[PDB]
From TrEMBL, chains A, B:
The lineage of its organism: Archaea, Methanobacteriati, Methanobacteriota, Stenosarchaea group, Methanomicrobia. It is an enzyme of class 6 (ligase). This is Pyrrolysine--tRNA ligase. It is found in: Cytoplasm. GO terms for biological process: tRNA aminoacylation for protein translation. Keywords: Aminoacyl-tRNA synthetase, ATP-binding, Cytoplasm, Ligase, Nucleotide-binding, Protein biosynthesis. GO terms for molecular function: ATP binding; pyrrolysyl-tRNA synthetase activity; tRNA binding.
């Protein structure tokens, strides 16, 4: 008895990476569904009894402790930002990916512009070097893909003044991903906003783009010192850590809790 | 020499509750500004050297530990939600306060609808009672006021099944605000969405509205058991804790860091 696409889709929702079950072994859909429902209810009950922290929240807290302890100031800046920031970032009419709000606002697609403003302002009060970071929601319209979400969570850390070299940027990235237990390589790439990037890759999955300044865009943001920075997607980190097949398992969602289907 | 409105406004930006300085003593603006700039640079330098955690982030983490330890599951749900949720909540054409995104979406003005969906789904898998909470950004268009932000941070905790009484709701609120060191009273009020509320007041400042179910809206959300819940604004909690005159000192902002002006 062969499984329909709808039946396979339902079993895939209930399947977890740790399972090893053949979906098309010939066992009937009813028994495969019942087995997976039982495994997932047990998993959720164990979370509720013993491990009540959300994966995205817990990872944000772990990353926050890492950067605070290394001397970076924790920033929480607006998610709803002026639309004028988009063109000023060199996103010329990525631009199609912006969620607009009212007539003059949008949802931020990255943390960089708010962090650029903080670097400039804090440089008037704090000693060299200025080290800051932020973790929070960012928004992009995307085609359906196993590695993209329209609502995702970014970490960006950055530094301005002394110590803003490629070697120090790579060392921070290495210490960070070693702390999380994630292997990686660095490959060159390029993007419209920042130019050349050092992309942090786990296999074919891009975990981060990082940048060594200065870049021409600096003048438009009042940045006038060396700087380094890197942006990472937290859901991509979670996808690696938990071997999820689709990044949706990691997202803000009413459909998955810590990678377990909530449709039980 | 009298201070202009622009001069007083600048000094108020730089003034902090712990200061006691007369702005209109007759001392010249230049000296008052220089004194306040020096106090604020010292305050920011001390934060950077010793206390690098953001007040909103730190408070979210403190609240998260409180509720996780008391048996509530930590939720992180979408901020960008379907516009259809608004009318289904009984917000008839508050409705004017909704930030719309594209044609079918909006920024959530509260956490309740996403938490209602989680209560319903989790009740099929978890033992009675179901206890969950969320902390995160919410959005409302507001008139300019000392107690309102357009981008704010909500905590909502809620419970469904046994133990969903007024006395237990008040006891959780009392334990929570005792943990934060904030005195309060409970006053009855009423709102369009939920009906009668127990409003948690610190003086004339509304910290929370709380609700004892069931209510007629339950049927439209598939909720069919007793429930209790309460929503609190984190920036209002911070305003009380730090004696801020305006809630903007507590907000996500590029203009204040932990209540200290970033325009230094
Ligand atoms: N839509 C998305 N969903 C999930 N994570 C994302 C998304 N877009 C970017 N990220 C994460 O944010 C990081 C920094 O953003 P960046 O602008 O470099 O992404 P990107 O180069 O557009 O990524 P990609 O090429 O995969 O679309 C990325 O390396 C990735 O980890
Ligand atoms: N615009 C806002 N800015 C900051 N906090 C808010 C805002 N709106 C609501 N809150 C906080 O969220 C809690 C729950 O939201 P609720 O819908 O009860 O607010 P509300 O009754 O509209 O508040 P208010 O009467 O002060 O406008 C409030 O008690 C308050 O602490
Ligand atoms: N627009 N903008 N931001 C500007 C623009 C001009 C100058 C300086 C900043 C801000 O530089 C920072 O401190 N943040 C990190 C920058 C690189 C982020 C990483 N490549 C990412 O894509 O996640
Ligand atoms: N819409 N909606 N939510 C509905 C709608 C119907 C039924 C059940 C919920 C969700 O009930 C919850 O579990 N959350 C807390 C509810 C009260 C929140 C508090 N008064 C506040 O205003 O912050
Ligand atoms: K497997
Ligand atoms: K999404
Ligand atoms: K004072
Ligand atoms: K605001
Ligand atoms: Mg992209
Ligand atoms: Mg890329
Ligand atoms: Mg990239
Ligand atoms: Mg209101
Ligand atoms: Mg009210
Ligand atoms: Mg209220």
């Amino acid at each position: 008895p062969a499984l329909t696409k709808s039946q396979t889709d339902r079993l895939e929702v209930l399947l977890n990476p740790k399972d090893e079950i053949s979906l098309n072994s010939g066992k009937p859909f009813r028994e495969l569904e019942s087995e997976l429902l039982s495994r997932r209810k047990k998993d959720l009950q164990q979370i509720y009894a013993e491990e009540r922290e959300n994966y995205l929240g817990k990872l944000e807290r772990e990353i926050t402790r890492f950067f605070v302890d290394r001397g970076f100031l924790e920033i929480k800046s607006p998610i709803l930002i002026p639309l004028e920031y988009i063109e000023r970032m060199g996103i010329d009419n990525l631009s199609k990916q912006i969620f607009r709000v009212d007539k003059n606002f949008c949802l931020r697609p990255m943390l960089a512009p708010n962090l650029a403003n903080y670097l400039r302002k804090l440089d008037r009060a704090l000693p060299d070097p200025i080290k800051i970071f932020e973790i929070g929601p960012c928004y992009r319209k995307e085609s359906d893909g196993k590695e993209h979400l329209e609502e995702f969570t970014m970490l960006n850390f950055c530094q301005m003044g002394s110590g803003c070299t490629r070697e120090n940027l790579e060392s921070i990235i290495t210490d960070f991903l070693n702390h999380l237990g994630i292997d990686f390589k660095i490959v060159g790439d390029s993007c419209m906003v920042f130019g050349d990037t050092l992309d942090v890759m786990h296999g074919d999955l891009e975990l981060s783009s990082a940048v060594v300044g200065p870049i021409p865009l600096d003048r438009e943001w009042g940045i006038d010192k060396p700087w380094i920075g890197a942006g990472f997607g937290l859901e991509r980190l979670l996808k690696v850590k938990h071997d999820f097949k689709n990044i949706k398992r990691a997202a803000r969602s009413g459909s998955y809790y810590n990678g377990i289907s909530t449709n039980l």
